[PDB]
């Protein structure tokens, strides 16, 4: 029950500044009149954010697919209740568990279920002449839903001469999906007003899935007919160190990104804001290794295994030959790669990781048996041959390598 809207017009993404907004309370602890250094995921100051606007040239209605990466800072400037909902998921299909956060009318429904999404999912509000409030009418986000878990319903994320700039931060740490937000009336028509504020923690849902790609649900005006307006900014969080000055009221009033520029790194080092005249020592300029070279001693005499596997004659099993091999480099790679051998059964250490394995002696025992007698190779194996003949000790066993030689 999904609709494919192939009419979307695709263009290279626009860009804008982020200034200094994007700071959120790192932990649910009250701090007062203190400078605190934290190391968490943040939006770097004065970074490039990808402003997505339902503009025009062919009305540019915009609802692209944006990778989730390692958390997302979203910010919408709205007046007409358009940008409503979000979708999170690594493949955005019915094969991988997915997240749907719908801020529908009178409610917010957060679901983690196996959804079969639309190729172009969204929601659709249709006006009714009877009711001034628009009726949430079209709900076309998944074609089917099954295996629902953690169906969470709470009070809806509150809706605030002013545009209600709403800022959200979405994080997913160790199976906890943290949602941060703050609403502020603003004047600036399209972008963040010069100023600073911090987002409250609200809720931290226990959602135990992986997210790498995501989508924005939007409202479309049907006068199919489409419209939108307003605008949604997206920025990508990175590991950073931030210095935050908690005031007397416990509200974060300012923060400093410790890697923005040398001045900010200085302030981050002195744990203060006003720096006196003069030189300071901040960090260490250490060049990085361009590459790594691993060198191993020149190939020397090999262990002569080409004279025992390809030997013309093989001794009788009652007088099995056991040759000592030592003082040579053991290149088992070629013999393991050769497919002429019937099997390759090494115990304890897998053949893929014996290259780094080093040994103090090896005894190569060579004989001929039957295929049904291979099952007689066991620690303290039972049977006439295994008892009155060559017996494998009950201790740990080495490796067995066999091939059929009927011809």
């Amino acid at each position, epitope marked *: 029950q999904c609709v494919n809207l192939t009419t979307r017009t695709q263009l290279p993404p626009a860009y804008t500044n982020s200034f200094t907004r994007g700071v959120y309370y790192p932990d649910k602890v009250f701090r007062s009149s203190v400078l605190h250094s934290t190391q968490d995921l943040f939006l770097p100051f004065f970074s490039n954010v990808t402003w997505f*606007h*339902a*503009i*025009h040239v062919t*009305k*540019r209605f915009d609802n692209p697919v944006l990778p989730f990466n390692d958390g997302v800072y979203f910010a919408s400037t709205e*007046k*007409s*209740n358009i940008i409503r909902g979000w979708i999170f998921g690594t493949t955005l299909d019915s094969k991988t568990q997915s997240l749907l956060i719908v801020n529908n009318a009178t409610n917010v429904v957060i679901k983690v279920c196996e959804f079969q999404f639309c190729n172009d999912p969204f929601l659709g509000v249709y*006006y009714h002449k009877n009711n*001034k*409030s*628009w009726m949430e009418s079209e709900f076309r986000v998944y074609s089917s839903a099954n295996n629902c878990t953690f169906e969470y319903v709470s009070q809806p994320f509150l809706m605030d*001469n002013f545009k209600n700039l709403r800022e959200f931060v979405f994080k997913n740490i160790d199976g906890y999906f943290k949602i941060y937000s703050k609403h502020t009336p603003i*004047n*600036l*028509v*399209r972008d963040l007003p010069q100023g600073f504020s911090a987002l409250e923690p609200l809720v931290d849902l226990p959602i135990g899935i992986n997210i790498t790609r995501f989508q924005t649900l939007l409202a479309l*005006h049907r*006068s199919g*007919w*489409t*419209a*939108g*307006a*307003a*605008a949604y900014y997206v920025g990508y969080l990175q590991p950073r160190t931030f210095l935050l000055k908690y005031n007397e009221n416990g509200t974060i009033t300012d923060a400093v990104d410790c890697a923005l520029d040398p001045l900010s790194e200085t302030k981050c080092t002195l744990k203060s804001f006003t720096v006196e005249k003069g030189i300071y020592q901040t960090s260490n300029f250490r060049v990085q290794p361009t590459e790594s070279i691993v060198r191993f001693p020149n190939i020397t005499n090999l262990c002569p295994f080409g004279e025992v596997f390809n030997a013309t004659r093989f001794a009788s099993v009652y007088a099995w030959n056991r040759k000592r091999i030592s003082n040579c480099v053991a290149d088992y790679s070629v013999l393991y790669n050769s497919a002429s051998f019937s099997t390759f059964k090494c115990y304890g250490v897998s053949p893929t990781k014996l290259n780094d394995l080093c040994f103090t002696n090896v005894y190569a025992d060579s004989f001929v048996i039957r295929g049904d007698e291979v099952r007689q190779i066991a620690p303290g194996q039972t049977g006439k041959i295994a008892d009155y003949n060559y017996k494998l000790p009950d201790d740990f066993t080495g490796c067995v390598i066999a091939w059929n030689s009927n011809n």
Partner: antibody
Amino acid sequence: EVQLVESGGGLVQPGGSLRLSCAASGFTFSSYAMTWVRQAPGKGLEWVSYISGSGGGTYYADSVKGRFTISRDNSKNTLYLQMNSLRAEDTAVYYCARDRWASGWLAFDVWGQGTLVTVSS
Amino acid sequence: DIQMTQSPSSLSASVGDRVTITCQASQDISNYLNWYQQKPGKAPKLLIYDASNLETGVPSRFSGSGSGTDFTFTISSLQPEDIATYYCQQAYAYPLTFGQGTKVEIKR
């Protein structure tokens, strides 16, 4: 040919109620917005209202709070403006404007011909 | 809101002369400003949006410049028919911000 002609402007007594009409053709009144502005004879411009695909997400000026109410229309797809509690100093020629995108500031387009309204006994 | 000090209120300059209409504001609007043309008894017309981009249907002889707190809006070669009322308008804290207007006339 883009055209936005205005009608309904004229004589209303103080406190009267009226629906001004701004009839639209040659485009899409939805994906494009509309905006009432007014020119007083001998005076400057002053904006009144927005509209954005619907008349619920709009705005009004500090000087116009409570008097005017914008509205649209389906099918024939025209614009309406409801007036109440007019005052004598508000006589002006009103204009129903437009835009083209809205997401990234709001730049007008059609700038229609304008219609005169005067309120007196 | 923001106050717009648009000057001069009136100006007379001969044919071909350059005309610059300075449109003032309050704080760092940068280039986000547009200019509109109003003929007497006629509906307003688009001239330039974002102070730098020329749209369709506008003669190339119309030019505009300035950013931040000052704006030029400079006319290259004055034609006898350019006489109209010009308004400078913007968008930032809602276009409540309008200008008192400038009346241009031509010496002949």
